[PDB]
Design a protein around this nucleic acid. Structure first.
Lengths: 108, 189, 117, 100
RNA sequence: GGGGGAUGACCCCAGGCGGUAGGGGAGCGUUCCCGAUGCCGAUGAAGGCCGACCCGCGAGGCGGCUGGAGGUAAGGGAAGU
RNA sequence: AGGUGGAGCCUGGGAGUGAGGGCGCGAGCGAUAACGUCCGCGUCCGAGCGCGGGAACAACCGAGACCGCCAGCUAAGGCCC
RNA sequence: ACCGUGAGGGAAAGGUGAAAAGAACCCCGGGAGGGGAGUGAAAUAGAGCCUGAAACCGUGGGCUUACAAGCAGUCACGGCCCCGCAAGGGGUUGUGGCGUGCCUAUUGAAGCAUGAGCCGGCGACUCACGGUCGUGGGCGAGCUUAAGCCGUUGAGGCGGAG
């Protein structure tokens, strides 16, 4: 078993969240089509963090396929404190809440 | 009484009623006290800053409330007021008194004039091996009028004079010696 | 004369917190009503502190009835007859009996009924 | 093995299982000691008799130990600006039920 | 308060004890100055993290995990507690 | 006189509120009207005179809360559920 | 820096390590960033990278959840789950049982009166000269200005107008 990740990830932690909460604990290859042919952004991303995942293993963490995702999660952090229209007087900034992305890949 | 004379094998001197006596802790410390006291230093926090800038504490009827203290780094509130009268002039009588009874405590150790002569801080390593221990630990130099030369330097310095060498002096726990002329301060006593 | 109170207060809180089981959604760590909720709970317990011993005075009350009547009568009868007693007077344990040892209970049950009528 | 006398307080329904007992710092000190405990609940081997029939013989139990307050806290509080805190008390010295 | 207290403490009974402004007494940790013939620590200073011994208590001690370098005062003093 | 027993008196330091209501009674006013106010005699509450009762209800009847969960008699008030 | 035309205001922000030895090379990838190797006492010490707590968002697990009321909750009894202080306790609650939050100002307050969204740190009876009682103590005539001298530590000691 091994794992993929990546912080300083611009995106809706939340959104992201649905992402896995699907392909979640499941056959590699398998979901590997969930995110391949699912929808909402993150996917793309999500996918990515599955390849350097499947990789890392076999490569340096070792038995292919028989693998999957014993577990997957995402966390938020660093924000992006963003400034907007001065209450037409006072500032109102939002925050593109950065986004972490860990996710397991262990063998059957 | 047991006014032991140095040089050891040599003579013995008498105990002067003075020292003799009982004790008076209270004053005790007190003496003390009126020590550090007149002997510390002082301090405070900015007069300019802590009441330094302009200030537009803000109108009101707006969503707020209000160059003074209670919002950061600034103000103070009653700090180091350097203008902090530090002294503490005990009192003559008081003082003197202390040292006394004080010393009295010392008794509970006789420096032959003849020493007012020895000429090397390795002649101390001597008149040392004479009578060491832990009380020496304390130690506490002092001649009688004009200090015990070189005797003044080592790993226990301090050379009062038959005049000038009070509680602040050794009073503290401590243990020491005084060149007759020393007990020339007793006269001071 | 610095006072970085620090480390200290923080602690205290921890304090309470503990006082802070895992009660209701929130307070849970509610460094306030946290604290609060407390005060509350407390005194409560208290009054509870003396309470109970009551809740009992009664408990036995029924489990008691359960029998006192069983045979055929109430606790203003029994009682009366009971105190007709002379070298034997108790109530608590009495119950937890009538149920523990039938005979035992059953017994007195008699000597009683009698004492009475 | 199951009797029910009564001490400076009922605290009864026992036989051998030493029962945490109310204070009594005058006879106690007696470590594993022996002392009489009036009855009034004769229940032994399915045979009973007045607690007034009893009040004649009894039993005794060895002065075992000196339980040390089995934890218990008393948050004394109220919205009425009144707080405070004191922990358990009630101990007691333990002692087995010497039956007879 | 009172009957003898050896320093404790022990025994009687009298005798209450709910309490905000507010009055009197007693204690607790907080950062510093003593080192009143005081010094612990790389097999952890300290803070942190967690706990079913000690105290009415505010705190203590003590044991397990963390972390890179300190500082503790058995006693009195001081205060931006 | 005093059964009492524990209040009393003077000197002196430190105070707080300096505007309260609620109930019974005797008066004032008031349409003998008001959870009205205004003086008196006792109580009452005081942000804890916290608990029992009267459903619930400071508050009116009983009660003086040092602490003791698996004791015992009663108060007022109750006992067909 | 920044708002102000101006006079003027006027911030925030420090910390790896013993030293860089600061991560050659190989991996998924457009990269950032993640997987190995290597430095290494430790990198969950790893580049705004010492300690790095709380609030707050996650990932798994125990227990628990669809004829049920209250922040609370706390007293009783029960079942599941763990017994590095074992025949005693941990945690969670199904029921029932008794329960009106918390602060200021108020005759009086649950409050529908106000105070507060949440956490962490700042943040409020102080100092000086007088006077005033009480107390710890030095002499009863008690007591010292300012200064002169002595001063690793720097050691106080003389000063007699008042």
């Amino acid at each position: 078993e091994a794992k993929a990740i990546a912080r300083y990830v611009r995106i809706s932690p939340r959104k992201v969240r649905l992402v896995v909460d699907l392909i979640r604990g499941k056959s590699l290859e398998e979901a590997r089509n969930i995110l391949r042919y699912t929808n909402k952004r993150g996917a793309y991303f999500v996918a990515k963090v599955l390849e350097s995942a499947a990789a890392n293993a076999v490569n340096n963490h070792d038995l292919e396929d028989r693998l999957y995702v014993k577990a997957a999660y995402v966390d938020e952090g660093p924000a992006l404190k963003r400034v907007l229209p001065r209450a037409r007087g006072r500032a109102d900034i939002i925050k593109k809440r950065t986004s972490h992305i860990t996710v397991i890949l262990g063998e059957k | 009484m047991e006014a032991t004379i140095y040089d050891n094998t040599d003579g013995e001197v008498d105990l002067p009623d003075v020292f003799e006596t009982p004790v008076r802790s209270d004053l005790i410390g007190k003496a003390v006290r009126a020590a550090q006291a007149n002997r510390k230093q002082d301090y405070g926090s900015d007069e300019y800053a802590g009441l330094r800038t302009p200030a537009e504490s803000f109108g009101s009827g707006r969503g707020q409330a209000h160059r003074v203290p209670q919002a950061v780094k600034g103000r103070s509130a009653h700090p180091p007021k350097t203008e902090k009268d530090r002294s503490l002039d005990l009192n003559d009588k008081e003082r003197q008194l202390a040292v006394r009874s004080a010393l009295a405590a010392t008794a509970d150790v006789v420096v032959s004039d003849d020493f007012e002569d020895l000429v090397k801080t390795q002649e101390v390593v001597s008149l040392l091996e004479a009578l060491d221990v832990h009380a020496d630990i304390d130690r506490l130099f002092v001649t009688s009028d004009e200090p015990s030369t070189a005797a003044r330097n080592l790993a226990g310095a301090d050379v009062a004079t038959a005049s000038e060498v009070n509680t602040e002096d050794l009073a503290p726990g401590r243990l020491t010696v005084f060149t007759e002329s020393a007990l020339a301060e007793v006269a001071e006593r | 004369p610095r006072a970085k109170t620090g480390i200290v207060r923080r602690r205290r809180h921890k304090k309470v917190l503990k006082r802070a089981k895992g009660f209701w959604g929130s307070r849970s760590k509610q460094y306030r009503n946290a604290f609060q909720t407390l005060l509350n709970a407390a005194t409560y317990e208290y009054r509870d502190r003396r309470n109970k011993k009551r809740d009992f005075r009664r408990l036995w009350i029924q489990r008691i009835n359960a029998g006192a009547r069983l045979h055929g009568m109430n606790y203003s009868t029994f009682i009366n007859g009971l105190k007709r007693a002379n070298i034997d007077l108790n109530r608590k344990v009495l119950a937890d009996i009538a149920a523990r040892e039938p005979e035992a209970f059953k017994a007195l049950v008699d000597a009683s009924r009698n004492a009475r009528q | 093995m199951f009797a029910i006398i009564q001490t400076g307080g009922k605290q009864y329904r026992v036989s051998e299982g030493d029962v945490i007992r109310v204070e009594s710092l005058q006879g106690e000190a007696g470590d594993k000691v022996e002392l009489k405990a009036l009855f009034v609940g004769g229940e032994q081997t399915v045979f009973g008799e007045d607690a007034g029939k009893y009040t004649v013989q009894a039993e005794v139990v060895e002065h075992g130990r000196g339980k040390k307050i089995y934890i218990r806290k008393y948050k004394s509080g109220v919205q009425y600006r009144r707080r405070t805190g004191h922990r358990q008390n009630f101990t007691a010295i333990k002692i087995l039920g010497i039956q007879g």
